[PDB]
Amino acid sequence: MRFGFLLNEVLTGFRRNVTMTIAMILTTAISVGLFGGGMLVVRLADSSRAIYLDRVESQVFLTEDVSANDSSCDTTACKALREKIETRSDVKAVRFLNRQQAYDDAIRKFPQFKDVAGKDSFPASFIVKLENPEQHKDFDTAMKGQPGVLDVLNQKELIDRLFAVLDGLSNAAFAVALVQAIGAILLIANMVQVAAYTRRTEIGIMRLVGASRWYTQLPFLVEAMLAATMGVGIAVAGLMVVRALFLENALNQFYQANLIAKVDYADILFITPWLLLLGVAMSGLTAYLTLRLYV
Amino acid sequence: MRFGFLLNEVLTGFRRNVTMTIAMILTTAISVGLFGGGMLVVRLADSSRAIYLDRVESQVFLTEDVSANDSSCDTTACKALREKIETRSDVKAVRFLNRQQAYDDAIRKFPQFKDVAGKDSFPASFIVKLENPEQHKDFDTAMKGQPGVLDVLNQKELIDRLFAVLDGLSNAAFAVALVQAIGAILLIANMVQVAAYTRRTEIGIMRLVGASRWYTQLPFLVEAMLAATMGVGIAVAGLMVVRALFLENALNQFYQANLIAKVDYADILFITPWLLLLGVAMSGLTAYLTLRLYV
Amino acid sequence: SAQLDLNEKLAAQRAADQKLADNRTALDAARARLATFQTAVNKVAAATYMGGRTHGMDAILTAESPQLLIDRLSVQRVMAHQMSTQMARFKAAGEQAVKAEQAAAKSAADARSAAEQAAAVRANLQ
Amino acid sequence: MMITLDHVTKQYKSSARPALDDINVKIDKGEFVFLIGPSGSGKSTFMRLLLAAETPTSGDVRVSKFHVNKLRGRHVPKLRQVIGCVFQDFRLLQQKTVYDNVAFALEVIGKRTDAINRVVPEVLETVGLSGKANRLPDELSGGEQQRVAIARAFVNRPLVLLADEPTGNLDPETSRDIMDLLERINRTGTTVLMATHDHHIVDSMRQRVVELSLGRLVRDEQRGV
Amino acid sequence: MMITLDHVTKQYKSSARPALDDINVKIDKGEFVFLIGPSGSGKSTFMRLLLAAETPTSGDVRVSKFHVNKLRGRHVPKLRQVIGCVFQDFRLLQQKTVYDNVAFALEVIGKRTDAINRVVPEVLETVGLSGKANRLPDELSGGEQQRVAIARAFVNRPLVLLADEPTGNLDPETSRDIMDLLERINRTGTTVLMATHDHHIVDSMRQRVVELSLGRLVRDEQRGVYG
Ligand SMILES: Nc1ncnc2c1ncn2[C@@H]1O[C@H](COP(=O)(O)OP(=O)(O)O)[C@@H](O)[C@H]1O
Numbered sequence A, B: 001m002r003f004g005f006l007l008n009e010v011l012t013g014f015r016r017n018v019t020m021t022i023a024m025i026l027t028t029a030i031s032v033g034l035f036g037g038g039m040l041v042v043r044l045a046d047s048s049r050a051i052y053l054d055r056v057e058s059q060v061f062l063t064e065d066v067s068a069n070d071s072s073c074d075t076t077a078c079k080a081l082r083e084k085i086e087t088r089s090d091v092k093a094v095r096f097l098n099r100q101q102a103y104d105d106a107i108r109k110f111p112q113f114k115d116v117a118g119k120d121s122f123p124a125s126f127i128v129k130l131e132n133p134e135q136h137k138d139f140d141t142a143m144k145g146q147p148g149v150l151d152v153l154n155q156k157e158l159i160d161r162l163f164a165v166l167d168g169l170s171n172a173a174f175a176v177a178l179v180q181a182i183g184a185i186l187l188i189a190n191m192v193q194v195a196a197y198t199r200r201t202e203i204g205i206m207r208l209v210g211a212s213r214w215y216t217q218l219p220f221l222v223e224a225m226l227a228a229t230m231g232v233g234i235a236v237a238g239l240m241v242v243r244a245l246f247l248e249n250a251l252n253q254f255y256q257a258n259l260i261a262k263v264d265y266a267d268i269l270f271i272t273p274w275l276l277l278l279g280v281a282m283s284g285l286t287a288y289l290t291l292r293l294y295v
Numbered sequence C: 001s002a003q004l005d006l007n008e009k010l011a012a013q014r015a016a017d018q019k020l021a022d023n024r025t026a027l028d029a030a031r032a033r034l035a036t037f038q039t040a041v042n043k044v045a046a047a048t049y050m051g052g053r054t055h056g057m058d059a060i061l062t063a064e065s066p067q068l069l070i071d072r073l074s075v076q077r078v079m080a081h082q083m084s085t086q087m088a089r090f091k092a093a094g095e096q097a098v099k100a101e102q103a104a105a106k107s108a109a110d111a112r113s114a115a116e117q118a119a120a121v122r123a124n125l126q
Numbered sequence D: 001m002m003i004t005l006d007h008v009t010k011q012y013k014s015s016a017r018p019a020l021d022d023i024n025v026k027i028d029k030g031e032f033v034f035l036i037g038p039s040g041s042g043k044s045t046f047m048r049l050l051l052a053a054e055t056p057t058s059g060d061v062r063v064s065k066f067h068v069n070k071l072r073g074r075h076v077p078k079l080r081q082v083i084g085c086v087f088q089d090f091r092l093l094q095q096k097t098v099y100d101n102v103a104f105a106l107e108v109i110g111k112r113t114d115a116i117n118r119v120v121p122e123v124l125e126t127v128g129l130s131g132k133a134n135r136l137p138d139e140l141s142g143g144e145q146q147r148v149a150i151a152r153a154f155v156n157r158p159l160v161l162l163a164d165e166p167t168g169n170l171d172p173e174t175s176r177d178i179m180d181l182l183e184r185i186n187r188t189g190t191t192v193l194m195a196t197h198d199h200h201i202v203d204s205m206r207q208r209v210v211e212l213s214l215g216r217l218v219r220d221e222q223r224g225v
Numbered sequence E: 001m002m003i004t005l006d007h008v009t010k011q012y013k014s015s016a017r018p019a020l021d022d023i024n025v026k027i028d029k030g031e032f033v034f035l036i037g038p039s040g041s042g043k044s045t046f047m048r049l050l051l052a053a054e055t056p057t058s059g060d061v062r063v064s065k066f067h068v069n070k071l072r073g074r075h076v077p078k079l080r081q082v083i084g085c086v087f088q089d090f091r092l093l094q095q096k097t098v099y100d101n102v103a104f105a106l107e108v109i110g111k112r113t114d115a116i117n118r119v120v121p122e123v124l125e126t127v128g129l130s131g132k133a134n135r136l137p138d139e140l141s142g143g144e145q146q147r148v149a150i151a152r153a154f155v156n157r158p159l160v161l162l163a164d165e166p167t168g169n170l171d172p173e174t175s176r177d178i179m180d181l182l183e184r185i186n187r188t189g190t191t192v193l194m195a196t197h198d199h200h201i202v203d204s205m206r207q208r209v210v211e212l213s214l215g216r217l218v219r220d221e222q223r224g225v226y227g
């Protein structure tokens, strides 16, 4: 029935003991915050995959006169340079990117390329993929900075070290979020145990009056739900608190330094309904499984 | 005394509270492991500076009017810098690199830029060898904007904000540990009340039998400190497994780049006598204060 | 009288003609200066191409020796200072194509005005 | 119309008494049935068996409505509304008042609230706890907590109301002061079960007597002392 | 000086009738004085007053071998060794048997191990229900759970061995032996007392019967009966 006569006893229930009832909120906030840290570094990897290049990638440049002109590859020289690149078997996903379709994706990956970009913005590139990271050293030897094919770039072999840092810290964040989730699920598991221990006077009365079996555990469930909302209400604020605490040394300076793609509060805020729904779901299920085998 | 009797009821307390003790003994490990990881990363942060602390240099960069005019040093403005900079406490030897000399140094360091890279690339270098790295504050606050010197911007203290991004997360680990600390003292302080309901059948006889007050709460006191000792014992193994599972590849890739002083089992176990006594102190003092107030 | 009112201004006319003539041989210096400067600012976007990868913050993506990466940042921050001052050095030459180049045209118009004035006054003799 | 059970045993550990090996009791409408004997006969287990919190390993359980031997859990509390009983510590919330403690059951079963608050003084003015019932029961004397205990069984319309452990740590003079309140509620028609442990009561009332001796009928004559 | 209490007063939450007043009553060894006061009034105050658990706001309280009106840091269990009380309920440990339950009060003082095992074949036979010394407290019946509850207070021979309402949920046709074993402790030489609304039964012994109605003593007969 109406929740007005059900809300008036739960506040008294938090009022009787205060030295135990406040501890759970910060622990669930820490668990949710580290899990959201893992989510935000996964989304950071997803955003940084767009600006950077993946682990099957080794691009190549072309000769200056060939790259500075010859937009249509119907001529002899563009096909000759393309076949010179395609002599080896490493060519898999070369793209027809030259000049007019090469300005927009290249002004966003680096900020100082947009400076004085009116004259000689970007020549022909023809970015190509790779299947063998251990066997393209001779390919880079043939396609080195010798006159002809210009200098190349390889986003691996002590170059993708930031990716190897971030996925490892993402997995470490996943592991510590798992052990915080285990601690959280056991502490809100024995929440109802110590609550029924501290409120054992009326339990036999509720078994005596003959009320419905669904309605007996409803105050404990609404205390679990309001405790979950109290946890997530400071969990969504502690991320901003630690950002404004210890992100001002960098903030957006990695955008000009081209380390990360983007950072903004809305990217973290995109994950909040999923984490609060999973939090109230885990709170409800451990309420139900603990009440099933105790009374 | 009768120390042999104390070992048979601790297993009874463990078995009677099997679904209760496990969450707090698991989360005290994470509580001390956050502090241990923070101490490890600040030790790595101020040990990684030692790869350049032995070779701390400095410089004086002079205004382009007396560098683009003359290659070598044949002006009275350059001859004034032979004596007006050498009258300092932190000077070893001055070296006058030309625009050509430092330009060729920059070219052989990295083949970067074509049009602007030349005589007008950057002014000439007056390298000043620093005596002590700890007195860089007096170095960069002793000389200011003066005629003949365009900037007193340093060149060797500048790695410090490059690991300020590591420092920020290093202090953020301490901040996370201190945020979880309030909940940690709460979850160790409510143990004397959430376990008193189980031992209701035995606590009532010491209140009139003649048992000493120093021996009554001692079985209640020993549980918290044994829990804290096994918590730090499983916490150091957790640091071992997160170092050996999720902190090996990036550590090896940066140690091959020799930017770090590297950690091993012995380095992490070096701090451990401090954190074990810190953990047993924050167990024992809180457990000793909560027994008088709770009971 | 009116015949005698000639030689007092041939000196000023020759001075005006020589002031036009040497300024015609002095206006070429600004266009020669921009003809020296504009080649270093036209394909500098191609000079930072070929994977330049150095920008004055990290200098850490490649490493062989700790000593050899010090000048990868200590010179690159001075490069950042120089590309900050490069726009000022470009505009200090671009202002010469905006300021103090119409003075030759103004002097030519003033010389034509003096020529028609001298043609107007000389009707007292002729 | 016949509310009894027979051959109903639980057998926790058997030993001295496997609950109730053989019973042949009978409860009538308005029947006052005594229950005394030794301490180990298994009285409170049989009291829990009538409210069906103890699993009947043998026999079938039914009190005047339906067989509760094999019933689904949603229909388990559908018999417990007409069942009342009292205990030693009274299960009283010290923060609540006397009227709040009895109206808590009325507001937690869930009815029309305008038909709940109006009928609280309609049935609360029967015991001596009416008057100064807005105060906390901690400062009150020892004679009025049993009124609050029987009030929450008095407010509904009972059929299987019961009285187990009726006196406890209470004086014989106050017992004679409370027997009459416990008997006047039986004049409506609802029977009650007398489950004391004293022999000073059997001569005083002279009603139906059932005595158990470790699961066996010690004495059963249903008349007189 | 032996046990004397007077002028006790402990009012809680502005109680109108705290049942502690200026009763200058004197107790003695030998005759055991039984309180017949009203229920729910004052019977629990005697144990907490005599064991210095509920200190009165006024009135100096004296015991035989110590001081009750003033305590210190280490004197708070000093009286508790030579006295003993048994409550109504059993509170036995189901983790140990009956033989180990009576020895649980031996190690809490700091007794040496030479006399720990040297007294358990000396006091267990003094109890009427000596038992099999291997009985579970849960398995045993409700008749014998209180005699083993008072046996553990007997093992040190305390000077005070009172017990409030020793029957509990026990029939009086079986509780007579439990009542009749108390005079063994009484002619041991100690002081015993019990406060129970048990009229028409204790008048057979015709012992000292007192009553405290509202903090007022209405009877002080040395060998009287129930009023
Ligand atoms: N869960 C149980 N496990 C073992 N024995 C039990 C259990 N419940 C009841 N008993 C036994 O049944 C008997 C019930 O006695 P009971 O008539 O309830 O005593 P009283 O009337 O004084 O409460 C007890 O002696 C006890 O030993």
Ligand SMILES: Nc1ncnc2c1ncn2[C@@H]1O[C@H](COP(=O)(O)OP(=O)(O)O)[C@@H](O)[C@H]1O
Binding pocket: D142, D169, E012, E038, E039, E040, E041, E042, E043, E044, E045, E054
């Ligand atoms: N410090 C105190 N705080 C609250 N209540 C007290 C205190 N001291 C005594 N009382 C009350 O005094 C009453 C004494 O009644 P008593 O006859 O001892 O009850 P019982 O017959 O149940 O033992 C108790 O009900 C108790 O609530």
